């Protein structure tokens, strides 16, 4: 959907914060930016939903970690 492309946007904001944090995080985003980008460029429903969930999730974990 579009709702994904919206999330992608936040990726730069999140990766910026995720630099205090284990390499894992700033690396999950990478992994899922390439996925988002390339799925949005095929309109595959499965690959986009997949990625939409991956972002939502990793951002949330990043949220939680940062709040503490």
């Amino acid at each position: 959907a579009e709702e994904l492309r919206t999330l992608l946007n936040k990726s730069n904001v999140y990766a910026l914060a995720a630099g205090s944090l284990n390499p894992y995080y700033k690396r999950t985003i990478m992994m899922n930016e390439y996925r988002a980008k390339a799925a949005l460029k095929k309109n595959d429903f499965v690959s986009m939903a997949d990625a939409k969930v991956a972002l939502e999730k990793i951002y949330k974990e990043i949220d939680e970690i940062i709040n503490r």
Partner: protein, 633 residues
């Protein structure tokens, strides 16, 4: 005649609560006791306090816990009952408690940092504030660093470290630690320094039996297991050679060396009976019994990229699958009074064997089955004999053969009575495993002539635990009752084992004062007092990943300080020695018992000393004086 009697441990500890057990026998109404511990010899009054009164409401039985501050040192205890004053001289020990040391790993590289903790605790395992010396000895025994640190307000835990210089002696280092006050009592862990790199997988060799039977012609059959430290099964090729050890001498059996593939993480190999004998070739097979075997496996991944060596050692050569042990059975029997044997049946490696029937010589029915802890209890009867008792227990495992059964012999001497009064006491309890929370029936059996049995209206029982007096009470008894039963409740306070010793006293023979006593050692199922689980707190889900956050759940005792550490399981492929374990602890704790005999003694005075107690009376009956710091041997 009132008799006043005074009981305390054989050995008294400094800066810790000991208990004195005060008694008034054949006495009327209130009696005031003032108890006192002075230096030896002379007068200093290392502790005056502690005063109490015995009442017919408490049948004249009393505590009073005292604390002694703080060549071999001795104190003089001295309790005054009214005017009559009883005094005994007890041995003292500067040993504050225990030390346990933890190293983050078992093995280290030059130029890394050894992380180690030191736990400071008293003789009852609780944390303590003290001053300790620590020493890192090199492998040739040279102290090469020492910190003198105090664990006051440290809450039992002393974190330390030491960086190994890049330039240093390879081999087994030691960390030796002792209390400032008890420099003779030292504590040690080891750790290997070595040049190495963590392998990527582990290799496991187990014989299909934890021993070799010298007439089993199939030989010694082995399985070799390989598997990357992350789960997945290993594909490769493996070299396994055997060898014989006796006792620190090893002899390889080159003719035994085999190369076998490892497929789906497994290969198989055998040391034919043939090659073993042709290999050592001592005149006869039976020569090898008592010697041990080893399998040495070396596994090469197919890439050639990684390789790993590994060993199972000390597989005993045996004529029998078992061994019998009277180390838990008292060596003194009471003529005319049943003699209980705790037969301890182990496997060849050392583990307890379970469900193993054992019987005495002939027997000829009898028989009883070994329990979980590898203990079964046979009871035979004794006569009016004073000659030594020589019992022999053979295992009666079906499916075996007279050849293969184990055997063993032991001997008890009779308990000597006061001028041959043929008065005795016999404690029996049920042999089954004991957990805290359960309750234990302690059978009090009494032997004496009906002409005098009625004078015995009570027994006194003292529970010994970790070398301190833990509980003492009175077990009543109505004339005619030969057997009475005190239902003892087992709490965590009892771990990891306790001795129960009990005594009745009367005037008898010719208006003669007689103390008659027995004792018995009972094993509690070893475990933590509190608890400590470390589980995943990541409710649900699947594997975690490099770098990821992970949640841990810690379940343990309130307000307890917990210290962690995490180790690459590859470290353990290289060295699995010298790891810290609740078991290694309790074992330390048992090896510090002031009690020496599994129960009973040569006479009343023995029963006490052997169990770790001292006994003293206004009449003069009492234990010998213990002046030795350890048990005899």
């Amino acid at each position: 005649s009132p008799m006043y009697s005074i009981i305390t441990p054989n050995i008294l500890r400094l800066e810790s609560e000991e208990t004195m057990v005060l008694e008034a026998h054949d006495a009327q109404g209130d009696v005031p006791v003032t108890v006192t511990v002075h230096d030896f010899p002379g007068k200093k009054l290392v502790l005056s306090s502690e005063k109490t009164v015995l009442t017919p409401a408490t049948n004249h039985m009393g505590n009073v816990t005292f604390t002694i501050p703080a060549r071999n040192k001795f104190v003089t205890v001295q309790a005054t009952f009214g005017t009559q004053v009883v005094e005994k001289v007890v041995l003292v020990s500067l040993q504050s408690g225990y030390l346990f040391i933890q190293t983050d790993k078992t093995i280290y590289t030059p130029g890394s940092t050894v992380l180690y903790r030191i736990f400071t605790v008293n003789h009852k395992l609780l944390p303590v504030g003290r001053t300790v010396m620590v020493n890192i000895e090199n492998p040739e025994g040279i102290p090469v660093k020492q910190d003198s640190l105090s664990s006051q307000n440290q809450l039992g835990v002393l974190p330390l470290s030491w960086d190994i210089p890049e330039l240093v002696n390879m081999g087994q280092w030691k960390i030796r630690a002792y209390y400032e006050n008890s420099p003779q009592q030292v504590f040690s862990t080891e750790f290997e320094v070595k040049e190495y790199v963590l392998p990527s997988f582990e290799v496991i060799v187990e014989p299909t039996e934890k021993f070799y039977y010298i007439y089993n012609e199939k030989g010694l059959e082995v399985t070799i297991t390989a598997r990357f430290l992350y789960g997945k099964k290993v594909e490769g090729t493996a070299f396994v050679i055997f060898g014989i050890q006796d006792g620190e001498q090893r002899i390889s059996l080159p003719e035994s060396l085999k190369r076998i593939p490892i497929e789906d993480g497994s290969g198989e190999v055998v040391l034919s009976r043939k090659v073993l004998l042709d290999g050592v070739q001592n005149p006869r097979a039976e020569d090898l019994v008592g010697k041990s075997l080893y399998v040495s496996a070396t596994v090469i991944l197919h890439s050639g990229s990684d390789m790993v060596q590994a060993e199972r050692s000390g597989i005993p050569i045996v004529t029998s699958p078992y061994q019998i042990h009277f180390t838990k059975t008292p060596k003194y029997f009471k003529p005319g009074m049943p003699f209980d044997l705790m037969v301890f049946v182990t496997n060849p490696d050392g583990s307890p064997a379970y469900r193993v029937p054992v019987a005495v010589q002939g027997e000829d029915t009898v028989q009883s089955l070994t329990q979980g802890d590898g203990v079964a209890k046979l009871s035979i009867n004794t006569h009016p004999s004073q000659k030594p008792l020589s019992i022999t227990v053979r295992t009666k495992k079906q499916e075996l053969s007279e050849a293969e059964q184990a055997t063993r012999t032991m001997q008890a001497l009779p308990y000597s009575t006061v001028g041959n009064s043929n008065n005795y006491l016999h404690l029996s309890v049920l042999r089954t495993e004991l957990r805290p929370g359960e309750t234990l029936n302690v059978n009090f059996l009494l032997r004496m002539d009906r002409a005098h049995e009625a004078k015995i209206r009570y027994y006194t029982y003292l529970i010994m635990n970790k070398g301190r007096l833990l509980k003492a009470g009175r077990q009543v008894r109505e004339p005619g009752q030969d057997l009475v039963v005190l239902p003892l409740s087992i709490t965590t306070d009892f771990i990891p084992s306790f001795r129960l010793v009990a005594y009745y006293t009367l005037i008898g023979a010719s208006g003669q004062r007689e103390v008659v006593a027995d004792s018995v050692w009972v094993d509690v199922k070893d475990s933590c007092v509190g608890s400590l689980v470390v589980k995943s707190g990541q409710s649900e889900d699947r594997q975690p990943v490099p770098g990821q956050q992970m949640t841990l759940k810690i379940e343990g005792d309130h307000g307890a300080r917990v210290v962690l550490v995490a180790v690459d399981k590859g470290v353990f492929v290289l060295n699995k020695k010298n790891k810290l374990t609740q078991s290694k602890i309790w074992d330390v704790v048992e090896k510090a018992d002031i009690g020496c005999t599994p129960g009973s003694g040569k006479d009343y005075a023995g029963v006490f000393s052997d169990a770790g107690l001292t006994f003293t009376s206004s009449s003069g009956q009492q234990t010998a004086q213990r002046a030795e710091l350890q048990c005899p041997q």
